[PDB]
């Protein structure tokens, strides 16, 4: 299907914090982020450890624990017909554009078990868990007026922040990776100049 492009900014601490809040409240009910720790999310998002424990750790876990959830994969697979996959790496499995289009493409479909279908993910087993915010979206997708807390722009911002947090979760090293790679490439150009000059000198 045709995806909607979203510009994900991994330096936006506020956007990533809002996305982490949305993930902890609306997504950790069924999805784990078990491959990342609350402590590292707090450190990378600029969230104080006490604030992270108070505001985003609902499972009773420690700050250094993986973002596990009570819903076991087998039970969830039985209940929904499909297991809610761990979302730590979903931004790498699907990409941020796919996630952005998917979380905004839920529409009402009575023939489906959960009363919804998805344009990006047809016959998906996800219930439309963000319906309270977006509102009632029906088929071209249109939101029924006065059915959600947020308007189209506000819900788009919410989904963008959530997808930004997911993108960070999939690749928590991206910013440090760029910072280190800049210096590595500078040193390698510096060393290349010397190696090339040495080769030129010897090959006379």
């Amino acid at each position: 299907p045709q995806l909607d492009h979203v510009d994900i900014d991994l330096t936006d601490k506020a956007a990533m914090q809002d996305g982490a809040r949305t993930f902890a409240n609306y997504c950790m009910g069924c999805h784990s982020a078990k491959f990342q720790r609350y402590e590292r999310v707090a450190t990378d998002l600029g969230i104080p450890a006490d604030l992270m424990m108070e505001k985003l750790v609902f499972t009773g876990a420690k700050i250094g624990d993986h973002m596990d959830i009570g819903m076991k994969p087998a039970d969830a697979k039985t209940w929904f017909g499909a297991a809610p996959p761990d979302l730590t790496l979903v931004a790498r499995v699907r990409g941020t554009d796919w996630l952005y289009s998917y979380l905004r493409s839920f529409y009402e479909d009575p023939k489906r078990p959960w009363g919804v279908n998805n344009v990006i993910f047809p016959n998906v087993g996800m219930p439309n868990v963000l319906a309270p915010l977006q509102g009632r979206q029906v088929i071209q997708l249109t939101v029924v007026p006065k059915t959600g807390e947020l308007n189209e722009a506000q819900f788009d911002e919410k989904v963008k922040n959530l997808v930004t947090f997911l993108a960070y979760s999939a690749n928590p090293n991206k910013l440090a990776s760029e910072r280190i790679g800049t210096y590595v490439l500078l040193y390698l150009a510096f060393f290349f100049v010397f190696a090339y000059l040495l080769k030129r000198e010897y090959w006379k």
């Binding site: 506020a14 914090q17 809002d18 982490a20 809040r21 902890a24 409240n25 609306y26 600029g46 969230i47 104080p48 604030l51 992270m52 505001k55 985003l56 609902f58």
Partner: peptide, 16 residues
């Protein structure tokens, strides 16, 4: 600022 940004969605009314 961050505390408001991270406020849990679920609000609970409590006696007193």
């Amino acid at each position: 600022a961050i505390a408001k940004r991270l406020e849990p969605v679920g609000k609970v009314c409590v006696q007193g």
